Subunit: 52 residues, 4 copies
């Protein structure tokens, strides 16, 4: 494409990579922490039920 | 010509779509995990109460 | 062209900030709600034995 | 090395700084709230188990 069109594509591409990376990191963190809370709750409920 | 102004608008437009899409995805994920945890907590508490 | 770069950065910063504040509010409100739900349910359990 | 390339690099760099800053803030907030939830769940479960 033209110089200006390619520059625009370059800017959008590079920032999309940055945005996607940070997004994936936050998604993974939210998933990890939520998953752990569910694991903890599951284990704790089992322990409580086994105690009364 | 006006191509520089138009290209700037296109860059902003394209990245806005990306930014918004990732935002919605995180918003939905956070909401989903929050809802899941609330239901899990409420269900488990009922089970515990039904046992004493 | 330099003012164009500033315009792009400014406009996108405004949108980035808007979505950022929305997520911050969501996270805070949902976490607050979960803490309340957890404590309320625990109180019920403690009051039941 | 050109004016157009330096401009693209400039735009990408400046927005990356912004994106990174907001990312770190959200990361820290999620971590903080998740840590609090684990502590509150841990505290309450220990209390329940110690009460019956």
């Amino acid at each position: 494409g033209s110089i200006i069109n390619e520059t625009a594509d370059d800017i959008v591409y590079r920032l999309t990579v940055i945005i996607d990376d940070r997004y994936e990191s936050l998604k993974n963190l939210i998933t990890l922490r939520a998953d752990r809370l569910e694991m903890i709750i599951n284990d704790n409920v089992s322990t409580i039920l086994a105690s009364g």
